[PDB]
Amino acid sequence: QPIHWSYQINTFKAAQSAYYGRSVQFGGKGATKNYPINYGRAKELAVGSEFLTYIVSQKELDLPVWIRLGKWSSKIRVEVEAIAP
RNA sequence: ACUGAAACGAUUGUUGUGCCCCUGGCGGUCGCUUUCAAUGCCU
């Protein structure tokens, strides 16, 4: 559940590793296969955000206080409390 | 296969080109090197 959230729209690119770069149309010659050629804009969930989840288990659980999520393996602080009986 | 695996908004570019701290201006004005003195004493 999102408790507090914001979005950033940030561009991402393909690198020109060679000294010479041609902008090629996607599906053109030398570009005929589905790969991230050219550029795109990602609407990311931003640092200014907080989400709430619940884990239910039948045994005391050594939950990691850091996790990674998504397309770019991005860090989340997990702060966790066991809800007492 | 975490709505997954990899993922450069990049490449190039001179805040540039011209420009007299310039013009005018008397270190000027006033001012006695002055005041006193035996070529002297004797033949």
From TrEMBL:
<protein>
    <submittedName>
        <fullName>Slr7013 protein</fullName>
    </submittedName>
</protein>
